[PDB]
Design a protein around this ligand. Structure first.
Ligand SMILES: Nc1nc2c(ncn2[C@@H]2O[C@H](COP(=O)(O)OP(=O)(O)OP(=O)(O)O)[C@@H](O)[C@H]2O)c(=O)[nH]1
Ligand SMILES: Nc1ncnc2c1ncn2[C@@H]1O[C@H](COP(=O)(O)OP(=O)(O)CP(=O)(O)O)[C@@H](O)[C@H]1O
Ligand SMILES: Nc1nc2c(ncn2[C@@H]2O[C@H](COP(=O)(O)OP(=O)(O)O)[C@@H](O)[C@H]2O)c(=O)[nH]1
Ligand SMILES: c1ccc(Oc2ccc3nc(NCc4ccco4)[nH]c3c2)cc1
Ligand SMILES: [Ca+2]
Ligand SMILES: [Ca+2]
Ligand SMILES: [Ca+2]
Ligand SMILES: [Mg+2]
Ligand SMILES: [Mg+2]
Ligand SMILES: [Mg+2]
Lengths: 438, 424, 343, 54
C-alpha cells in the first residue's frame, strides 16, 4: 500500500476538496466523526482506502489532506462543518489577507511568507507514510492563491519530493461564474511555471460544469455547491482506482503511463455520464452502450471542445456500477463505426477499461440522482488545446495594452515573466498542433 | 475580520459622512445609541467591517470626524445618530480653512494633521486585518479638499500597502459656494491621481439635475443632494457589509476595476430614482442604471468607452432576468465598451434590499468619458489662472504660481491619458 | 437586436447577405474583432472555430462548417471517396482519380497500373492533372507528361472524352449547383443553377474549348458571349434545349443524379462536421460542379466551399440564405429544394 | 478487436481492448527568484517614501 496526500489551495481548491472528502466518506462508509464500522483492523492497516485515510488508535480515519488558503473564511467552513471531526488543526492552514486575484501576490509577496509553514505541515503527513506515492493538488487557475501559491508549492514539492508524482485538478476560468477580469493572466502565469512540475493535470472548465448543471440537473442558476458536487463525482471516478481494489490506474505513476506519452501534453479530457436530475422521480436507466456513446458528446465533457477535429493519444474508460466487459466491447465496436475517433500514428488505437462494481455514490439530498451505472472517460486529445487558444487570446488582448499589469509589477514581478509565460503557451499550442493536425 | 477605517473631513465630507452612517446603521439594525435591534443575523455577520464592538453589545462606528471649524461637527453631534460616534474621534480646530486649499493643505491643516493621525493609528491598532481607508470630502472647499488630500498623503506614508478609496464631491458653477472652487479641485485631483485606488466622482451638477429634472424638486438643498450620495455609498459598500455572492476585500475589488493606476475615477449611479409605490421591474432597474440621467458624474458615457463596469443589484429578484437584461444593455451599448478587456462587465447580487425599496441597483463605471469632468474643471481653472485672478488668497499662504502651473499640466496629462485609451 | 461581424471582405455572396441584414433594421454590425456577436461571416483560412460558443448568454452562428474542407479540396475529396464505405472505390458518379504527390516530397504505381490497362486494351487513355493551387492544368494522353508536370500535391483523374455538347456550337459546358446546409443539417438545393459554357467547338484532337471556366472563356476565347450572355446558360434555356434536341427534361435526365450526388457527399461527412449537439452552430453554402457526358450521365467534378454566385441570381439566393440559415436561428419581428434524408 | 490483460477481483475488473495496431530548479535558484522580487518591492516602496519625503 502506497499513500497519497491531497493538497487543496485557495477557495476553489478548498471547497472542491471539501466536496470530494465528503463523497469519499460516503463511498467508504466513514461517518462524520471519523469512525468506520466496516474497518476491522483498528488503529492501522494497509487496505486500499488507507492510501487516502490514516488511522488513529481510537479508530478515527483521518484524510491525508492539507488545506491552504491565504484568507480564513473558506477553511473556517471546514473547521465548523459536518466533517469537522475528520481533520485536526495542523491540516488547515490559513493566512489573514488573500492574494486579491493577483498571481504575483500569491506567488511572491504572500506566498514567500507561508510556504515554509505549508511544507512543514505536508512533511508531517509524509512522515506517517511508509511509501508515499505523491500528491493530488486542487486549485483554480483564476485565483491569486490558486494560481500564485500553487505554482510556488509545486516548485518546492519537486525539490523536496523529486521522485514523487504530482497530479492536478485545475478549475479553468469561466466568466459566467466569475466576478474577476485578470484570470487569463493568472491562468497563463501559473501554467507556465507549473508545467514542468506536474505529471498529469485534469482541467475542469466552470463553463462546462455550469451548463451541465443547467441542462441535465434543471438548475436555473447553479451555485458553487452545485458545481462542486458534480466535480467531486468526476474526481471520485478518477481517484477510485487508488482507493479500491483493482488493476488499472492503481498508482499515480500509472496515470502518466496510460494517459501522457509526451510530458508537456499532460492535460487529459474528462467526460462523464450519466448526469441525471434527482427531481425526476423515475428516469430510464441508460445502458452501457448509451453511457459509453455519451462519452463522445461534447455536451458531457469537462471542457467544451471538438475531439472530432483532433487526434487521440490515449483513452481510458472508468465504469462504476452494473457493467460487464462483454457489454463494454459491444459498445466500443458500435462507436467506432459511427464516431470520428482518430488516433495519432505513433500510438495504438485502443481503450484501457476499468470497472468498479460499486455504483456511484451520491450525496443524500443532493441534485444528482442515483444511477445503476456510470462512466468517466479520460482521453488525451489534442482538441483540448482549444481551451489554451481561448485563454491565450484573452491574454493577448489585455497584455497588448498592459492592462492590469501594474498590479503584478507592484508586487515584485517583472514584465518579462508575462512574455516568458506567453511564449511557453505559444510553444505548447504548437506542440498540440504538430501532434494532432496533418 | 477585515476592518475599514472611515474618515470624513470638512463641511461636505462630514455632512455626507453622517448620512452614510445613518443609512448603514439602519441597514444593520444599529440604533442611534449603538444598540443592535435587528431581526436577521445577516445584519451582524460583517458588522465588524465598519463598527467596533464595545462593552454591553454596543457597536461604535470606525469613523474619524475632522474639520478646521467646529460648526459642522457640532451639527453632527446634535444630529440624529450623533451620539453613536466615539467622542475621542472628533478632531477639530477653530480657525477654519476659508475655502482655501493652501490653508487646509499647508498652514491651518498642517497644524492639526498630526492629531488626526493619532486617532487613525489608534483605530488601526485595534484592527485584526485592516482592509484600508475611505474618505468623504468635497474638492471645492479648503478642509476636505486641502487637508483631506494632506491626510491621504500622510496615511500612505504610514500605511503604504493599504487601500485608500474616496467619495469626492466635484464642484460645479451651478451648485457653487466660492469662485475659487476650480483652483481647489485642480490641486486636489492630482493628489487623488497619485494616492487613491478608487475615487467615486460625485458631481454636484449631476446631483442637482437629478433632484430637479428627475425627482422634480424645484429648489434642491444640500440635504436633497446628500440623500443621493448616502444611497450610492450604501450601494457600493453592500458587497463588503452583507454576505452574498461577493466576499472580496477592497484590494480584490480594485484589482478587477482599475486596469491602469491613474485611471481610477469612477462614475457612480443608482436606481431607482423616484419622485412611488409601484414595483420596479428588472428591465426598468437595468435600463435606468445605464441611463446617463442616473449617472452622478455629469458625463455622457456615449462620449467615451467603458474600461470596466460593475453592477450590484439588491433585493429578491430573478437572476435569470437580470442576466438577460444585462445582455440586452450591452448590445445597445456594444460600441461603448473597450474590446481589449474581455468580460469587463460584471454583475453581483445581495438579497437584503435598502430601507424603503423592494429592490435597487448601484452602478460603478470606469469610463473614459470622465475626462469631460476633468476638462470642465480645467477650463474653469484656466479661465481665471490666465489672469491670475484670486491667486493672492493662495500666494498669501506661501504657495507659488509654479505649483498652479504644474497642477494645470498634471490634469491636462490626466485628460490626455483618458483620450489615448478611448481611441484604442 | 441581433449582432454580426464580417471577416471576409472579398466574399461577394455575404457582402450582399450583410447588406440585407442591415436593411432589416434588426441586425447591428460590429467590428471584426468584437467577440459579442450572434453571427460570424468568417474568413476562409484559419477560422477560429475554437473560440466560438463561449460568450455567456449568446447564441453564436458561423457561416462555415468546421471540417468541410475534406469535401472542398482536390486531394481530400479523392481520399474521402475512396476511403468512405458510403461512397467506396466503386463509386459510379466520380471519375477514376488518383492522388499524386510530387517527387520532391501516394498513388503513383496504382495510377500507372490502371493506365497500362487502357493503353493495352485500345481504350481512350486521356487523363487530366490539377490541384487546389490553380488559378495550371495539363491534359494529356501520355502518362509521362502528367507525372513530370506535377514534379515541376496534385490529382490525376480520367478526362471525360465523350461530353454532352450543346448545339449550335459543338461545345463543352459544366453545371454549377448551389447548396445550403443549415444548422439542423437540412440540405437545400437552390432551384436555379447555371451552365458555364465553352464558346469554342470541342476539339478531340489548346485548352480553351476544354476548360469551361468563366475566366478562361473571357480571357482566351474569341467567341465569348456569342451564344449566351457571359457564357452563362440558365436552367430554363437548358431545359428547353433538352426537350427540343433530346426529347427529355432537365429534371429527369440530369437533376435526379445531381440531387443524388449532393446528398451522398453531404450525408457522408455529416457525423464529422454536424453541429447538432455543439456549443455553436454552423451553416455553409456550397458550390457543386458537375459534368454531363453524351449518355446523359452526371459526373461530380469538385465542390467549392467558398463559391460565388451568378449576377442575375445574387439577390434571390442571398435572401434565401437570410431566410432559412440566419432567421431560422435568430427570428425577426420556397426557392430551395429540400433534399430529405435520415440524420 | 482483441481483449488483453483481463484482471478480476471481488470489487470489479479491468482489461484493455485494441482496435488497431500503431502505424528542475534547485532550492537555491528558487530562493534567488523569490528574494529578487522582494528586492524590487523594497526598491519601489523606498522610491515612494523618497517621493513622499520630498
Ligand atoms: N468550480 C468551482 N470554482 C470556484 C469555486 N470557488 C472559486 N471558483 C473559481 O475560482 C476562480 C476564483 O479564484 P479563487 O479560487 O476563488 O481565489 P483564491 O484561490 O482563493 O485566491 P485569492 O485571489 O487569494 O482569493 C473563479 O474563476 C471562480 O469561478 C468553487 O467553489 N467551485
Ligand atoms: N475529368 C474531367 N473530364 C473533363 N473535363 C474536366 C475534368 N476535370 C475537369 N474538367 C474541366 O475543367 C474545368 C474546371 O476544372 P476545375 O473545376 O478543377 O477548376 P476550378 O476548381 O478552378 C473551377 P471552380 O471555380 O468551380 O472551383 C471544368 O470546366 C471542366 O470542364
Ligand atoms: N453634495 C454636497 N456638496 C456640498 C455640501 N456642502 C458643501 N458642498 C460643496 O463642497 C464645496 C465647498 O466645500 P466645503 O466642504 O463646504 O468646504 P470645507 O469645509 O473647507 O471642506 C462646494 O463645491 C459645495 O458645493 C453638502 O452637504 N453636500
Ligand atoms: C462583480 C464584482 C464586483 C462588483 O462590484 C464592485 C466593484 C468594485 C467595487 N469597489 C468598491 N468599493 C466601495 C468602497 C468601500 C470603501 C470605499 O469604497 N465596491 C465595489 C463593488 C460587481 C460585480
Ligand atoms: Ca484498518
Ligand atoms: Ca518532477
Ligand atoms: Ca496657529
Ligand atoms: Mg480566496
Ligand atoms: Mg462650506
Ligand atoms: Mg476549385
Amino acid at each position: 500500500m502506497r499513500e497519497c496526500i491531497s493538497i487543496h489551495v485557495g477557495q476553489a481548491g478548498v471547497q472542491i476538496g471539501n466536496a470530494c472528502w465528503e463523497l469519499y466518506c460516503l463511498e467508504h462508509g466513514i461517518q462524520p466523526d471519523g469512525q468506520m464500522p466496516s474497518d476491522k483492523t483498528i488503529g492501522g492497516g494497509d487496505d486500499s482506502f488507507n492510501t487516502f485515510f490514516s488511522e488513529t488508535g481510537a479508530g478515527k480515519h483521518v484524510p491525508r489532506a492539507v488545506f491552504v488558503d491565504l484568507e480564513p473564511t473558506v477553511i473556517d467552513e471546514v473547521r465548523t462543518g459536518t466533517y469537522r471531526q475528520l481533520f485536526h488543526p495542523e491540516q488547515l492552514i490559513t493566512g489573514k489577507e488573500d492574494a486579491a486575484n493577483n498571481y504575483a501576490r500569491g506567488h511572491y509577496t504572500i506566498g514567500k511568507e507561508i510556504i515554509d509553514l505549508v511544507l512543514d505541515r505536508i512533511r508531517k503527513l509524509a512522515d506517517q507514510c511508509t511509501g508515499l506515492q505523491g500528491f493530488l493538488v486542487f486549485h483554480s487557475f483564476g485565483g491569486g492563491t490558486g494560481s500564485g501559491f500553487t505554482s510556488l508549492l509545486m516548485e518546492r514539492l519537486s525539490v523536496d519530493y523529486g521522485k514523487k508524482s504530482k497530479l492536478e485538478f485545475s478549475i479553468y476560468p469561466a466568466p459566467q461564474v466569475s466576478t474577476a477580469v485578470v484570470e487569463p493572466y493568472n491562468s497563463i502565469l501559473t501554467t507556465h511555471t507549473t508545467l514542468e512540475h506536474s505529471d498529469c493535470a485534469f482541467m475542469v472548465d466552470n463553463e462546462a460544469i455550469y451548463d451541465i448543471c443547467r441542462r441535465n440537473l434543471d438548475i436555473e442558476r447553479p451555485t458553487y455547491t452545485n458545481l462542486n458536487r458534480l466535480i467531486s463525482q468526476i474526481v471520485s471516478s478518477i481517484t477510485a482506482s487508488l482507493r479500491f481494489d483493482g488493476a488499472l490506474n492503481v498508482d499515480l505513476t500509472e496515470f502518466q503511463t496510460n494517459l501522457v506519452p509526451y510530458p508537456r501534453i499532460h492535460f487529459p479530457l474528462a467526460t462523464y455520464a450519466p448526469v441525471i436530475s434527482a427531481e425526476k422521480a423515475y428516469h430510464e436507466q441508460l445502458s452501457v452502450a448509451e453511457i459509453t456513446n455519451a462519452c463522445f458528446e461534447p455536451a458531457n465533457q469537462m471542457v467544451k471542445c471538438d475531439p472530432r477535429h483532433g487526434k487521440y493519444m490515449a483513452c481510458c474508460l472508468l465504469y462504476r456500477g452494473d457493467v460487464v466487459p462483454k457489454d463494454v466491447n459491444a459498445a466500443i465496436a458500435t462507436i467506432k463505426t459511427k464516431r470520428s475517433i482518430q488516433f495519432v500514428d505513433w500510438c495504438p488505437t485502443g481503450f484501457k477499461v476499468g470497472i468498479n462494481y460499486q455504483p456511484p455514490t451520491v450525496v443524500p439530498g443532493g441534485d444528482l440522482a442515483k444511477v445503476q451505472r456510470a462512466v468517466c472517460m479520460l482521453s488525451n486529445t489534442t482538441a483540448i488545446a482549444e481551451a489554451w487558444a481561448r485563454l491565450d487570446h484573452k491574454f493577448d488582448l489585455m497584455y497588448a495594452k498592459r492592462a492590469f499589469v501594474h498590479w503584478y509589477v507592484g508586487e515584485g514581478m517583472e514584465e518579462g515573466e508575462f512574455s516568458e509565460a506567453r511564449e511557453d503557451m505559444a510553444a505548447l499550442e504548437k506542440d498540440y498542433e504538430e501532434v494532432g493536425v496533418d | 475580520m477585515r476592518e475599514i477605517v472611515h474618515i470624513q473631513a470638512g463641511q461636505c465630507g462630514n455632512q455626507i459622512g453622517a448620512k452614510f452612517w445613518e443609512v448603514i446603521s439602519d441597514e444593520h439594525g444599529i440604533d442611534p445609541t449603538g444598540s443592535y435591534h435587528g431581526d436577521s443575523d445577516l445584519q451582524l455577520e460583517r458588522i465588524n467591517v465598519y463598527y467596533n464592538e464595545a462593552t454591553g453589545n454596543k457597536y461604535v462606528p470606525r469613523a474619524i470626524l475632522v474639520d478646521l471649524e467646529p460648526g459642522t461637527m457640532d451639527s453632527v453631534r446634535s444630529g440624529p445618530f450623533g451620539q453613536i460616534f466615539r467622542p475621542d474621534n472628533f478632531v477639530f480646530g477653530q480657525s477654519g480653512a476659508g475655502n482655501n486649499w493652501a490653508k487646509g493643505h499647508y498652514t491651518e491643516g498642517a497644524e492639526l494633521v498630526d492629531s488626526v493621525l493619532d486617532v487613525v493609528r489608534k483605530e488601526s491598532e485595534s484592527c485584526d486585518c485592516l482592509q484600508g481607508f475611505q474618505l468623504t470630502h468635497s474638492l471645492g472647499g479648503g478642509t476636505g479638499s486641502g487637508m483631506g488630500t494632506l491626510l491621504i498623503s500622510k496615511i500612505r506614508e504610514e500605511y503604504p500597502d493599504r487601500i485608500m478609496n474616496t467619495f469626492s464631491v466635484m464642484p460645479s458653477p451651478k451648485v457653487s459656494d466660492t469662485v475659487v472652487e476650480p483652483y481647489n479641485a485642480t490641486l486636489s485631483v492630482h493628489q487623488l491621481v497619485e494616492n487613491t485606488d478608487e475615487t467615486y466622482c460625485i458631481d454636484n451638477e449631476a446631483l442637482y439635475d437629478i433632484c430637479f429634472r428627475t425627482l422634480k424638486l424645484t429648489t434642491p438643498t444640500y440635504g436633497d443632494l446628500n440623500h443621493l450620495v448616502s444611497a450610492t455609498m450604501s450601494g457600493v459598500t453592500t458587497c463588503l457589509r452583507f454576505p452574498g455572492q461577493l466576499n472580496a476585500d477592497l484590494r480584490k475589488l480594485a484589482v478587477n476595476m482599475v486596469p491602469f493606476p491613474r485611471l481610477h475615477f469612477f462614475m457612480p449611479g443608482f436606481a431607482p430614482l423616484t419622485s412611488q409605490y409601484r414595483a420596479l421591474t428588472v428591465p426598468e432597474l437595468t435600463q435606468q442604471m445605464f441611463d446617463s440621467k442616473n449617472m452622478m458624474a455629469a458625463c455622457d458615457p456615449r462620449h467615451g468607452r467603458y474600461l470596466t463596469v460593475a453592477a450590484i443589484f439588491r433585493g429578491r429578484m430573478s437572476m435569470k432576468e437580470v442576466d438577460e437584461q444585462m445582455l440586452n444593455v450591452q448590445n445597445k451599448n456594444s460600441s461603448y465598451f473597450v474590446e481589449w478587456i474581455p468580460n469587463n462587465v460584471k454583475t453581483a447580487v445581495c438579497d437584503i434590499p435598502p430601507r424603503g425599496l423592494k429592490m435597487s441597483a448601484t452602478f460603478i463605471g470606469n469610463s473614459t468619458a470622465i475626462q469631460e469632468l476633468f476638462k470642465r474643471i480645467s477650463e474653469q481653472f484656466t479661465a481665471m489662472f490666465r489672469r491670475k485672478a484670486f491667486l493672492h488668497w493662495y500666494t498669501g499662504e506661501g504657495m507659488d504660481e509654479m505649483e498652479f502651473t504644474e497642477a494645470e499640466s498634471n490634469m491636462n496629462d490626466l485628460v490626455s491619458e483618458y483620450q489615448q485609451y478611448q481611441d484604442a | 437586436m441581433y449582432t454580426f461581424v464580417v471577416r471576409d471582405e472579398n466574399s461577394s455572396v455575404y457582402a450582399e447577405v450583410s447588406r440585407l441584414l442591415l436593411a432589416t433594421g434588426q441586425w447591428k454590425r460590429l467590428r471584426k474583432d468584437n467577440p459579442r456577436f450572434n453571427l460570424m461571416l468568417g474568413e476562409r483560412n484559419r477560422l477560429p472555430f475554437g473560440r466560438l460558443g463561449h460568450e455567456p448568454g449568446l447564441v453564436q452562428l458561423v457561416n462555415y462548417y468546421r471540417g468541410a474542407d475534406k469535401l472542398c479540396r482536390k486531394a481530400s475529396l479523392v481520399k474521402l471517396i475512396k476511403t468512405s464505405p458510403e461512397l467506396s472505390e466503386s463509386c459510379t458518379w466520380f471519375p477514376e482519380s488518383y492522388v499524386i504527390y510530387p517527387t520532391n516530397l501516394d498513388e503513383r504505381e496504382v495510377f500507372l497500373a490502371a493506365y497500362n490497362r487502357r493503353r493495352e486494351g485500345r481504350e481512350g487513355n486521356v487523363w487530366i492533372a490539377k490541384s487546389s493551387a490553380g488559378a495550371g492544368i495539363l491534359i494529356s494522353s501520355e502518362a509521362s507528361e502528367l507525372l513530370d508536370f506535377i514534379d515541376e500535391v496534385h490529382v490525376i483523374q480520367k478526362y471525360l472524352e465523350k461530353p454532352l455538347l450543346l448545339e449550335p456550337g459543338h461545345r463543352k459546358f459544366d453545371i454549377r449547383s448551389w447548396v445550403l446546409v443549415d444548422h439542423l443539417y437540412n440540405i437545400y438545393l437552390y432551384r436555379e443553377g447555371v451552365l458555364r459554357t465553352s464558346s469554342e467547338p470541342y476539339n478531340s484532337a489548346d485548352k480553351t474549348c476544354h476548360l469551361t471556366n468563366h475566366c478562361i472563356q473571357k480571357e482566351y476565347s474569341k467567341n465569348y458571349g456569342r451564344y449566351e450572355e457571359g457564357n452563362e446558360m440558365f436552367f430554363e434555356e437548358f431545359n428547353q434545349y433538352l426537350m427540343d434536341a433530346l426529347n427529355t427534361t432537365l429534371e429527369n435526365s440530369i437533376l435526379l443524379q445531381i440531387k443524388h450526388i449532393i446528398r451522398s457527399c453531404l450525408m457522408c461527412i455529416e457525423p464529422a462536421i454536424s453541429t447538432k449537439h455543439l456549443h455553436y452552430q454552423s451553416f455553409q453554402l456550397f458550390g457543386f460542379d458537375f459534368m454531363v457526358d453524351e449518355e446523359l450521365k452526371v459526373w461530380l467534378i469538385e465542390v467549392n466551399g467558398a463559391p460565388a454566385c451568378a449576377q442575375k441570381l445574387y439577390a434571390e439566393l442571398c435572401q434565401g440564405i437570410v431566410d432559412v440559415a440566419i432567421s431560422s436561428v435568430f427570428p425577426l419581428a420556397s426557392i430551395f429544394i429540400k433534399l430529405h434524408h435520415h440524420h | 478487436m482483441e481483449v488483453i490483460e483481463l484482471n478480476k477481483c471481488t470489487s470489479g475488473q479491468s482489461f484493455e481492448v485494441i482496435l488497431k495496431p500503431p502505424s528542475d530548479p534547485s532550492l537555491e535558484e528558487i530562493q534567488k527568484k523569490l528574494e529578487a522580487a522582494e528586492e524590487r518591492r523594497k526598491y519601489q516602496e523606498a522610491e515612494l517614501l523618497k517621493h513622499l519625503a520630498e
